[PDB]
Structure 1
Amino acid sequence: GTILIDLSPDDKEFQSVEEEMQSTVREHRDGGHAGGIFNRYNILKIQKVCNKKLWERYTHRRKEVSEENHNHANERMLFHGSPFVNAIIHKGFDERHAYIGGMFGAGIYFAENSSKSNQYVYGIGGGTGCPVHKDRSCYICHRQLLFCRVTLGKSFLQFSA
C-alpha cells in the first residue's frame, strides 16, 4: 500500500523538513562513537510516505488518545532512526521496532535531535556502522531517517541524565 513521492528541493515542505534535520544536530557525549563526527548533513532526498491504511490506523488511535486527554492529541514531529526503516514505511511501527533495552522500557523511541536518531540508523550504539565499510562515521554511505507524526497524549515526564 505504500507509495513514496519525491519532494522537490524547491518545495517549501522539502525546505522545512531539511531545516528541522539540520537545526537539531548537536554534539553527543560519545564524541561521535555511535553516529559519527559531523555538524551537518548532505540531504540527498526527501520522500513523502503515503499509505492510506497506516494513516487511518494512526488517526483512529489519535482520536482515541485525544478523547482521553481533553481533545488534545499532543502531536509532535519527531525523528526515528532504525535499521528497519524499510519495514516501517511498508508495514507501520510495531513491537519489532521497539527498543527492548531502552531506558524507559521496551517501547518505540523518537528524538527531537536528528543527530540522536542518527546514532541508531546502523543499530543500537550504531552497531558495526555502515554495511559496506563497517564505519559508524562513514561519510560515503547513504543513511535514512524517518521524520514522524507522533501522538504523545498525556506524557509521563521522566527527568533523566
Structure 2
Amino acid sequence: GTILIDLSPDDKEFQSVEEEMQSTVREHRDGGHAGGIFNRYNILKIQKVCNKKLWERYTHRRKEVSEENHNHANERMLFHGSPFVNAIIHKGFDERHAYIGGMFGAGIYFAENSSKSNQYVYGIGGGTGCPVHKDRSCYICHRQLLFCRVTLGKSFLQFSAMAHSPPGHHSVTGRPSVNGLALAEYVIYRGEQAYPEYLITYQIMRPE
C-alpha cells in the first residue's frame, strides 16, 4: 500500500528537506572510515512516502504517548540510514530494525546529523561499502536515507562520552557530552513511534 510521490526541486518542501540534509553534515571521529569523506551531498531525488495503514498506526501511537506526557508527543524529524530502507517504506519500522549492539540498548536509532545516518546506509561501520565497488567512500553509487517523523514522548536523557523503554519513558536521548559539535541521537523501542516520511536519494560529493 505504499506509494512514493516525487517532489520537484522548485517545491519549498523539497528545499526545506534538502536544507536539513546539507546543514547537518559534520566531521566524524572516524575520519570518514564508515560513511566516506565529504562536506556536502548531490541530492538526486526526494520522495514523499504515503501509506495510510502505516500513518494510522503512527498517529494512534502518538496520541497514547501524548496522553502519558502532559499532552506533548515531543515529535521530531530525524534521519535514519539503513540497508533495509526498502523494507521500511513498505512494511514500516519493527523489531528487525533494532540495533542489538547499540550504546543505548536494542532499539531503533535516529540522528539529528544526516552525516551520522549516512554511516549506516551500508550497515554497521559502513559494512563493506557500496555493492558495486566495495567502497565505503564511493562517489558514484546512489545512496538513500529516510527523514522520519519520530514520537519521543518523555525521553530519558543519557549523556555519552527489541529491548524496553526505561521505566516511565518513551524513548532515549543520547546527548554527546564530549564532542560539542555532534548533535543528538535518539532511540525508540516501538516501531509504531516513527513514520518514514521522505526518502532521499543522493550521492556524497568529493571535496574540491
TM-score by length of 1: 0.98
Equivalents in 1 of 2:5, 2:100: separation in Å?
32
Task: Give the Cα separation in 2 of the matches to 1:62 and 1:121.
Answer: 27
Report the CA distance between 1:62 and its aligned residue: 0.1
The Cα offsets for residues 128-147 of structure 1, whole Å up to 9 and x where unpaired, read as 00000000000000000000
Return the offset for 1:108. 0.1
CA-CA distance at 1:100 after TM superposition: 0.8
SS of aligned partner of 2:43: strand
Distance (whole Å) between structure 2 residues aligned to residue 52 and residue 62 of structure 1: 15
Deviation at 1:97, TM superposition (A): 0.7
Q: Where do 4+ consecutive residues of structure 1 move more than 3 Å?
A: none
Q: Aligned with 2:53: secondary structure?
A: helix
User: Residues 85-108 of structure 1, C-alpha deviation per residue, up to 9 Å, x if partnerless?
Assistant: 000000000011111100000000
Consecutive unaligned residues of structure 2, counting only runs of 5 or more, are 160-208
Give the distance between the partners of 2:141 and 2:95, measured in 1 at CA: 28
Higher strand share: 2
| Cα offset, 1:114, TM superposition | 0.1
Equivalence for 2:70? 70
SS of residue in 1 equivalent to 2:17: helix
Displacement of 1:25 after TM fit? 0.1
Q: Deviations over 1:53-102 (max 9, x none)?
A: 00000000000000000100000000000000000000000011111100
Matches within 5 A, 1:66-145: 66-145=66-145
1:1-54 deviations in whole A, cap 9, x for unaligned? 000000000000000000000000000000000000000000000000000000
The structure where helix makes up a greater share of residues is: 1
> Counterpart in 1 of 2:4?
4
Residue 23 of structure 1 corresponds to: 23
Q: Provide the aligned length of Structure 1 versus Structure 2.
A: 159
Query: TM-score, normalising length from structure 2?
Result: 0.76
Q: How far apart in 2 are the matches of 1:28 and 1:106?
A: 23
1:37 and 2:37 matched: yes
| Partner Cα separation in structure 2 for residue 36 and residue 93 of structure 1 | 26
| C-alpha distance in 1 between matches for 2:108 and 2:131 | 23
For residues 101-158 of structure 1, the C-alpha deviation after alignment (integer angstroms, 9 at most, x for no partner) is 0000000000000000000000000000000000000000000000000000000000
**Cα root mean square deviation, aligned:** 0.2
